[PDB]
Design a protein around this ligand. Structure first.
Ligand SMILES: CCCCCCCCCCCCCCCCCC(=O)OC[C@H](COP(=O)([O-])OCC(O)COP(=O)([O-])OC[C@@H](COC(=O)CCCCCCCCCCCCCCCCC)OC(=O)CCCCCCCCCCCCCCCCC)OC(=O)CCCCCCCCCCCCCCCCC
Ligand SMILES: COC1=C(OC)C(=O)C(C/C=C(\C)CC/C=C(\C)CC/C=C(\C)CC/C=C(/C)CC/C=C(\C)CC/C=C(\C)CC/C=C(\C)CC/C=C(/C)CCC=C(C)C)=C(C)C1=O
Ligand SMILES: CCCCCCCCCCCCCCCCCC(=O)OC[C@H](COP(=O)([O-])OCC[N+](C)(C)C)OC(=O)CCCCCCCCCCCCCCCCC
Ligand SMILES: CCCCCCCCCCCCCCCCCC(=O)OC[C@H](COP(=O)([O-])OCC[N+](C)(C)C)OC(=O)CCCCCCCCCCCCCCCCC
Ligand SMILES: CCCCCCCCCCCCCCCCCC(=O)OC[C@H](COP(=O)([O-])OCC[N+](C)(C)C)OC(=O)CCCCCCCCCCCCCCCCC
Ligand SMILES: CCCCCCCCCCCCCCCCCC(=O)OC[C@H](COP(=O)(O)OCCN)OC(=O)CCCCCCCCCCCCCCCCC
Ligand SMILES: CCCCCCCCCCCCCCCCCC(=O)OC[C@H](COP(=O)(O)OCCN)OC(=O)CCCCCCCCCCCCCCCCC
Ligand SMILES: CCCCCCCCCCCCCCCCCC(=O)OC[C@H](COP(=O)(O)OCCN)OC(=O)CCCCCCCCCCCCCCCCC
Ligand code: SF4
Ligand code: SF4
Lengths: 96, 385, 178, 157, 79, 67, 315, 56, 92
């Protein structure tokens, strides 16, 4: 029971790389959740999908560190996602 | 009775309402609502636009009931042309007509509570609303302000798969209405602030032209959808939720009951929607399919003329009224033989309801006025037009 | 068919048991406690919100979003300046003036969509015979200055080139319907 | 690092972060764009998460979202409410009705833009500008608020 | 009586309100302990008990606190 | 999920126990390991004062049978 | 030392006061199907500090006014609320006062002025009315609030809050006197102008914050929330008596921590769950529904002691 | 969903309803995107005969 | 003194805030009902006073007189309330 939830929690925390990775995700994406990388675009954005979660949150993008020169560590904006991968993120097309 | 000019204080909102009032302490002596803070010219602008380019104005007239309004202009333009929409389109309009009623009632009941002070019902049902918007978007392209119901039927057939989802949602929405209930229908406190506030007699409601739940709440039985059927609302079976001891609480109960009855109408529409076309086949009134206009000369000519010039409705005038979620929404569309209308007075269920604010909120406290603006579902777009 | 809401069918005469049940309802706020239970229940439900930058609310192919002008695969801009996109625009947003290009082809010297004037009806998407003007998927084009929102042919053509891959996929999915 | 310049860059970074993290939105709820934000306040796209509170009285209000047409009868008011907001204040114009006249541009009763009445910081486009689209616009205000360097300008002034 | 009934079901606070008013106006009158309050509080010794001279004409007064004479609070004990 | 509300509650709680443990150990330090005498009524202040005079100046120091 | 004991008992409460707003903006959230503020900082822990810095930096508009009330009032609200934590007997109190509950009742009563002064100080006739609502209700609810305590005291024997730790060594005073707990809880909801009874800041503008922005807004603001805790804490000493062991004083404070947080959670839960009462609906409750119940149950608490030979031991 | 049974039981009870059966959040029940291509039906008036407009 | 020390810190903390707050940034509303309430309030507030010594008076040796007195006070005021209800008072 409760142990299971704690267990999956550990998986999540330990999942995003070392503590460095967790902090990278914890502080800029504000979500420690692990999914399956569905691809990495040439800009650097990494896209993931967790079909187990609800429709709203089964597909997420972890934006890059630098796009077109600008640092995007903290100043992440949606448009960073490339037009090709925009529809996958918005569920316009179910195909990566 | 020190005029307080309340309402530019964003206190009941529903738009921007300067309800100049004279209050002896906390009692309201007279309410003179001011209007036109949202007049925008919708009636004059339409005279300078063609029939199809005036369709988007109707969605904006009262945009919480985005489509139901479009159906009223549609019907009106179809009558003037003596054209009727194809069978599938009719069911669609009733399908999205009802979905829209729910959307309006979720707005009216939850926004009513937010002004009263209950805030959790709004978040509970705005999530359901959201899910509905998505139907609009996947059918029209826009979350709200679709332009889907056009004067000759719907614009494009439903996506391949929508019906199934308008089912999953409907299959569950009930529980969501049930929840709101366990929070407000019997709250020991909702009742007090709502019960016996703004009672309107039956004779007075007809006299001031209320024509909506406001009449139905007073016990007058009138649903233009049963009395004068439009589209295929005749082929469905629903129960009008009439009320007694008409007051803010009773009418509310009526709006929760039409949310319930609309799920009964939606179910049917999903169960019995016919195979067919979604727009009249008269290229004269409905634009030709894009494969046809790109391969057949008569279709291009009809596409070019329809988009550039227009329907060219035969000269005449009609007042067609539907049962928009707020109440009777009617368009009096006078039309010369030209492709652009001559007049289009929009009857707004709301111009009449506000007027009643004075005869409803008499000897009432400041908080009572807030409750009554809620029980009239005033969307300043329709009133101001 | 009608239905009475809030109409008491009959006068149940008070029975002590009934009275107690009622009095208890007023004295020990029983129904108020009922309402608290409902909210405690959701507190335990999963929240429906989405990380906005990381996750995006789903939009299907017909979403109108932001205007773009497409080009043929060869590289010839699709618009042939028939100018009925201007005719059917409800808001008077699109302004088009044209002249025969040197090639001899018909093309628009100036195509200006005033997005602040545009009400995103999507009729222009509908009206175009060559389907040169399309409602592109992007909805995030908020701009610091009003002038940026006014769009000339070069911005729209550039918008078209950037989003052509998704626009083509979206039109591919919905053309049978139209 | 050690330099009166570095201390003045870091401290505004602090002042900018506070204003950026907590923007209380004052929503002139004109027309329908107010609904497309009531959807932002709602659960699919919470705004509070981002520190933007659901509703604050004008006096307490860092941003003003002008949703809907600004008629020539509400203009004299918008300016009043903008003028009565606390100094640090920002305006976000939502809707083609507000940023420009939109449908109703040529009307005799509609101001062709709120920019004519109140200085506008971010213009969010779309007839019902989508709710993410407003959320992107509010996030763009946060990017504009991060870039501001008021303390640096006072130091080298 | 009938109103009483509805009163029990409508405006059911006053009923309870008055009922208590009375029950507090009765229990004191009829109770096996009411008397103790004036005693238990009387007994509680707050001010020093000054001793009287021994004229030797008093058998009632105990010559020593622990003597078998004088007042007792065994009533307080085992109360 | 609700557990995210916990971080905030924890910080509140830790910040509501500090005060009760703090006041109740800055007393047992200043008063020599013995709870600060509560002098509700004069008698107690007298006894307390008497204690001061009995030893050092502070009442907490407490002389015993060996004095 | 005593100074250190003033930092503790103040800062700790101020830091906790900040974390209540956060646990309010998240518990209300999850109840309404939304995460609440988690993006600033980790899980929103830095969120309370963020808005504090924004509020102080914004222009204290000082909107045209009577100036020394636009400044004195906010200060009184924070001063009285933080002051009332001075005698709370978390385990040992800080300043043990023989007539402690009268101190708490009197200090609360003084806060009604801040509402009156702020309402007069703004120059909006609207505000003048809004303050009236709060000032009137405050004194009104104060009348049952005080009588409910007098019933308690008579079963405690003294006005000192420290005595109740010895009165409640075997059973909470909820078991007995539960009927008043409820009536103390509802009155605690009114006196902190929380939801069910939050007419102030109501339709006026959804009263005495109308003209208050930035630093003044914050101080009352802080005051309200500290009160929100204090009154809940008084419920957790007077009616829910945390277990006290003389050998280890902190399990008293540990349980005081647990009960205070849960009852503080309850008024958060009440707010989201109920619509706000009407102005007269609110006074109708106190003068009609509660005051007759309280005055009669007050007499029952002068009788229960005597005929049950249970007169409480003074001291 | 994805809720430990106990939380679900508390949920169902506090609400008084089997909220699990009808969850608001959508999970793999919503119509998949890229539903198959649609061949829509052509209505009347597309006959190539006896279709004179004057008669319609 | 100990209280004085605490209180002045309390005012100092608040005056500090307002000062920084102002330094870091660099006609006839009358209803007898309202007056009537205030009055009633004191009539009740005074009574609260005559009822406050009851904790010390519980220990009074008399007891009978104590309760006889206290019950009379509570009853006569409540009747005052009763007439307030009966009259338009308390009916706003
Ligand atoms: C406090 C004691 C622990 C509370 C607890 O474990 O609650 C979750 C646990 C499961 O609750 P749930 O609603 O089923 O959780 C959703 C998923 O099942 C489980 O959610 P999941 O599938 O996302 O599982 C992964 C999750 C798993 O995380 C947990 O379940 C443990 C959370 C501990 C919070 C402390 O870990 C995370 O996602 C990252 C967040 C971890 C906790 C963040 C907050 C920590 C606050 C620390 C200071 C307080 O609660 C219970 O077992 C019953 C509690 C009954 C209370 C009455
Ligand atoms: C009623 O709806 C609401 C609003 O609208 C009025 C709000 O604005 C707000 C305000 C938003 C907040 C998150 C709360 C604001 C809280 C504060 C000002 C906290 C201030 C905290 C501090 C000063 C930190 C503690 C101080 C110290 C350690 C310094 C000691 C010397 C809330 C909570 C709300 O829910
Ligand atoms: C004590 C009162 C608060 C003082 C500052 C507390 C910490 C502020 C902080 O951590 O900033 C995080 C913020 C986090 O927000 P952000 O500005 O990096 O952007 C957030 C990006 N997403 C949306 C992905 C979360 O980073 C900064 O503000 C950088 C500058 C901080 C300067 C602080 C020292 C001066
Ligand atoms: C674990 C968290 C438990 C939360 C419990 C409340 C939320 C769940 C409610 C579920 C529900 O719907 O049932 C309500 C139910 C629903 O009942 P109902 O209102 O539908 O009708 C039943 C009652 N009759 C039929 C007589 C009308 O309400 C009740 O059962 C009565 C509640 C009485 C509450 C009285 C006031 C509160 C108690 C005050 C005294 C102090 C108690 C302890 C306080 C704390 C001490 C530490
Ligand atoms: C301490 C002694 C007793 C003080 C109170 C009783 C006597 C009050 C005399 C007031 C004389 C007029 C005056 O002060 O005018 C300023 C004000 C009224 O005018 P004002 O200061 O609001 O005017 C503002 C004008 N501008 C904007 C230009 C700055 O007097 C008041 O009524 C407010 C309080 C005044 C100071 C009282 C301090 C009391 C501190 C208690 C702790
Ligand atoms: C010996 C006999 C003893 C009999 C005891 C009876 C119960 C004691 C308390 C009774 C309080 C008075 C009362 O009956 O209710 C008043 C009011 C409801 O009144 P209403 O139903 O509107 O009737 C109006 C008639 N003119 O009640 C209210 O409306 C209160 C307003 C709502 C405020 C929030 C209510 C919910 C609170 C939930 C948590 C409660 C926790 C209480 C305990 C906390 C810990 C101590
Ligand atoms: C000490 C404090 C005691 C209470 C002090 C205040 C008492 C005030 C009583 C006023 C009664 C008259 C009244 O005005 O109320 C009538 C009531 C409706 O009240 P409402 O709708 O609020 O409007 C008030 C103005 N009419 O409608 C009513 O008729 C209410 C009737 C209340 C009385 C019902 C019967 C009560 C007694 C029941 C006894 C049951 C057995 C008790 C046994 C006791 C044994 C010791
Ligand atoms: C801001 C305005 C409100 C200020 C906060 C409210 C303070 C309320 C004080 C009420 C009385 C406190 C009290 O009576 O305690 C007296 C204390 C101990 O006395 P006692 O309980 O009898 O114990 C004796 C045996 N242990 O020992 C004492 O003798 C204390 C003597 C009084 C201490 C007062 C502390 C300063 C409060 C006044 C500050 C004045 C400056 C602000 C003026 C504001 C004007 C509006
Ligand atoms: S319609 Fe299509 S092609 Fe004709 S002008 Fe407008 S855009 Fe260019
Ligand atoms: S912009 Fe489009 S949506 Fe926003 S108000 Fe004007 S019309 Fe309504």
């Amino acid at each position: 029971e409760l142990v299971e939830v704690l267990k999956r929690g550990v998986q999540q925390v330990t999942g995003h790389g070392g503590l460095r990775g967790l902090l990278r995700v914890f502080f800029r994406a504000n979500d420690i959740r692990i999914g399956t990388l569905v691809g990495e675009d040439k800009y650097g954005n990494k896209y993931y999908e967790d079909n187990k979660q609800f429709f709203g949150r089964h597909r997420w993008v972890i934006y890059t560190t630098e796009m077109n020169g600008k640092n995007t560590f903290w100043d992440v904006d949606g448009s960073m996602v490339p037009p090709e991968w925009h529809r996958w993120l918005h569920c316009m097309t179910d195909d990566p | 009775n020190m005029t307080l000019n309340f309402g530019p204080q964003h206190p009941a909102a529903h738009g921007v309402l300067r309800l100049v009032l004279e209050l002896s302490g906390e009692m309201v002596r007279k309410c003179d609502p001011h209007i036109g803070l949202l007049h925008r010219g919708t009636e004059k602008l339409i005279e300078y636009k063609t029939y199809l380019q005036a369709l988007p104005y109707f969605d904006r007239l009262d945009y919480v009931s985005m489509m139901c309004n479009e159906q009223a202009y549609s019907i009106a333009v179809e009558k003037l042309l003596n054209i009727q929409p194809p069978p599938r389109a009719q069911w669609i309009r009733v399908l999205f007509g009802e979905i829209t009623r729910i959307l309006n009632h979720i707005m009216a009941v939850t926004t009513h509570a937010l002004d009263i002070g209950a805030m959790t019902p709004f978040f509970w049902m705005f999530e359901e609303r959201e899910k509905m918007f998505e139907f609009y978007e996947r059918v029209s392209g826009a979350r709200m302000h679709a332009a889907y119901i056009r004067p000759g039927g719907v614009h494009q057939d439903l996506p391949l798969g929508l019906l199934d989802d308008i089912y999953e949602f409907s299959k569950n929405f009930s529980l969501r209405i049930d929840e709101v209930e366990e929070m407000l229908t019997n709250n020991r406190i909702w009742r007090n602030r709502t019960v016996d506030i703004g009672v309107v007699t039956a004779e007075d409601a007809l006299n001031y032209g209320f024509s909506g739940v406001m009449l139905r709440g007073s016990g007058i039985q009138w649903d233009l959808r049963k009395t004068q059927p439009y589209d295929v609302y005749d082929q469905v079976e629903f129960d009008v939720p009439i009320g007694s001891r008409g007051d803010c609480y009773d009418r509310y109960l009526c709006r929760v009951e039409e949310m319930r009855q609309s799920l009964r109408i939606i179910e049917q529409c999903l169960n019995k929607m016919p195979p067919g076309e979604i727009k009249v086949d008269d290229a004269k009134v409905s634009p030709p399919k894009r494969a046809e206009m790109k391969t057949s000369m008569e279709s291009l000519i009809h596409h070019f003329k329809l988009y550039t010039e227009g329907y060219q409705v035969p000269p005449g005038a009609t007042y067609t009224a539907i049962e928009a979620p707020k109440g009777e929404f009617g368009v009096y569309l006078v039309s010369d033989g030209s492709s652009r209308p001559y007049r289009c007075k929009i009857k707004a269920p709301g111009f009449a309801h506000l007027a009643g604010l004075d005869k409803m909120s008499k000897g009432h406290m400041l908080a009572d006025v807030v409750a009554i603006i809620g029980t009239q579902d005033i969307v300043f777009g329709e009133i101001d037009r | 068919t009608y239905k009475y809401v809030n109409k008491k069918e009959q006068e149940s005469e008070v029975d002590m048991k009934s009275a107690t049940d009622n009095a208890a309802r007023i004295l020990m706020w029983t129904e108020l406690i009922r309402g608290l239970g409902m909210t405690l229940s959701y507190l335990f439900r999963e929240p429906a919100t989405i990380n906005y930058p990381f996750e995006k609310g789903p939009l299907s192919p017909r979403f109108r979003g932001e205007h773009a002008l497409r080009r043929y695969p060869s590289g010839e801009e699709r618009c042939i300046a028939c100018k009925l996109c201007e005719a059917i625009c409800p808001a008077q947003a699109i302004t088009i003036e044209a002249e025969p290009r040197a090639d001899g082809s018909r093309r628009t010297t100036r195509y200006d969509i005033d997005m602040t004037k545009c009400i995103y009806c999507g009729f222009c998407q509908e009206a175009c015979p060559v389907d040169a003007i399309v409602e592109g998927p992007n909805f995030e084009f908020s701009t610091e200055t009003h002038e940026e929102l006014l769009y000339n042919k070069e911005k729209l053509l550039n918008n078209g080139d950037k989003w052509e891959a998704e626009i083509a996929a979206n039109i591919q999915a919905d053309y049978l319907y139209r | 690092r050690s330099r009166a310049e570095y201390v003045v860059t870091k401290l505004d970074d602090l002042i900018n972060w506070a204003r950026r993290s907590s923007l209380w939105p004052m929503t002139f709820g004109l027309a329908c764009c107010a609904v497309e934000m009531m959807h932002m306040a709602a659960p699919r796209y919470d705004m509070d998460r981002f520190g933007v509170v659901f509703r604050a009285s004008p006096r307490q209000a860092d941003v003003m979202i002008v949703a809907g047409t600004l008629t020539n009868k509400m203009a004299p008011a918008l300016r009043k409410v903008y003028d009565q907001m606390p100094e640090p204040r920002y305006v976000v114009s939502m809707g083609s009705c507000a940023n420009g006249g939109g449908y109703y541009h040529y009307s005799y009763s509609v101001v062709r833009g709120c920019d004519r009445i109140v200085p506008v910081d971010i213009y969010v486009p779309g007839c019902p500008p989508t709710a993410e689209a407003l959320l992107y616009g509010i996030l763009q205000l946060q990017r504009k608020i991060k870039r501001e360097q008021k303390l640096k300008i006072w130091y080298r002034r | 009586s009938a109103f009483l009934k509805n009163a029990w079901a409508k405006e059911p606070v006053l009923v309870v309100s008055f009922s208590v008013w009375g029950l507090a106006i009765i229990m004191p009158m009829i109770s096996p302990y009411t008397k103790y309050a004036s005693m238990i509080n009387k007994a509680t010794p707050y001010n020093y008990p000054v001793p009287v001279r021994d004229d030797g004409n008093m058998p009632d007064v105990p010559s020593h606190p622990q003597d078998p004479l004088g007042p007792s609070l065994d009533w307080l004990k085992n109360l | 999920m609700w557990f995210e509300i916990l971080p905030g509650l924890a910080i509140m709680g830790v910040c509501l126990v500090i005060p009760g443990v703090s006041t109740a150990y800055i007393h047992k330090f200043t008063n020599g390991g013995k709870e600060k005498r509560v002098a509700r009524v004069q008698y107690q202040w007298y006894l307390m004062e008497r204690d001061r005079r009995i030893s050092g100046v502070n009442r907490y120091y407490v002389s015993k049978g060996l004095e | 030392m005593f100074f250190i004991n003033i930092l503790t008992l103040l800062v700790p409460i101020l830091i906790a006061m900040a974390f209540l707003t956060l646990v309010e903006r998240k518990i209300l959230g999850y109840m309404q199907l939304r995460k609440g503020p988690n993006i600033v900082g980790p899980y929103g822990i830095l969120q309370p500090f963020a808005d504090a810095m924004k509020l102080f930096m914004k222009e204290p508009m000082r909107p045209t006014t009577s100036m020394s009330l636009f400044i004195i009032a906010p200060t009184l609200s924070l001063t009285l609320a933080l002051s009332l934590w001075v005698p709370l007997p978390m385990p040992h109190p800080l300043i043990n006062l023989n007539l402690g509950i009268l101190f708490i009742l009197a200090t609360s009563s003084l806060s009604v002025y801040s509402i009156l002064w702020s309402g007069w100080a703004s120059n909006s006739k609207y505000s003048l009315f809004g303050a009236l609502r709060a000032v009137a209700q405050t004194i009104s609810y104060e009348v049952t609030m005080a009588i409910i305590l007098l019933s308690v005291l008579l079963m405690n024997g003294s006005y000192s809050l420290q005595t109740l730790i010895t009165t409640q060594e075997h059973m909470w005073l909820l078991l007995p006197a539960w009927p008043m707990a409820m009536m103390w809880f509802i009155s605690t909801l009114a006196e902190t102008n929380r939801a069910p009874f939050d007419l102030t800041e109501g339709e006026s503008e959804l009263g005495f914050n109308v003209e208050y922005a930035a630093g003044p807004f914050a101080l009352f603001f802080m005051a309200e929330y500290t009160n929100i805790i204090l009154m809940n804490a008084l419920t957790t000493i007077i009616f829910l008596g945390p277990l006290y062991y003389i050998n280890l004083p902190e399990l008293y404070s540990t349980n005081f921590m647990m009960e205070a947080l849960l009852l503080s959670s309850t008024f958060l839960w009440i707010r989201a769950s109920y619509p706000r009462f009407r102005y007269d609906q609110l006074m109708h409750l106190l003068w009609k529904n509660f005051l007759p119940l309280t005055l009669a149950l007050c007499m029952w608490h002068i009788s229960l002691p005597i005929f049950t030979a249970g007169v409480p031991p003074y001291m | 969903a994805s809720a430990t049974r106990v939380i679900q039981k508390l949920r169902n009870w506090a609400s008084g309803q089997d909220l699990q059966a009808k969850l608001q959040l959508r999970y793999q029940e919503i119509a998949k995107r890229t539903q198959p291509p649609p061949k829509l039906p052509v209505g009347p008036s597309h006959k190539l005969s006896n279709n004179y407009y004057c008669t319609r | 003194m100990n209280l004085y020390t605490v209180i002045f810190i309390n005012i100092l903390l608040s005056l500090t805030l307002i000062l920084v707050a102002f330094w870091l940034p660099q006609r006839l509303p009358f209803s007898m009902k309202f007056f009537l309430v205030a009055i009633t309030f004191l009539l009740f507030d005074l009574e609260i006073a005559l009822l406050l010594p009851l904790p010390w008076a519980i220990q009074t040796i008399k007891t009978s007189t104590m309760m006889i007195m206290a019950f009379i006070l509570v009853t006569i005021l409540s009747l005052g309330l009763a007439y307030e209800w009966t009259q338009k008072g308390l009916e706003w």
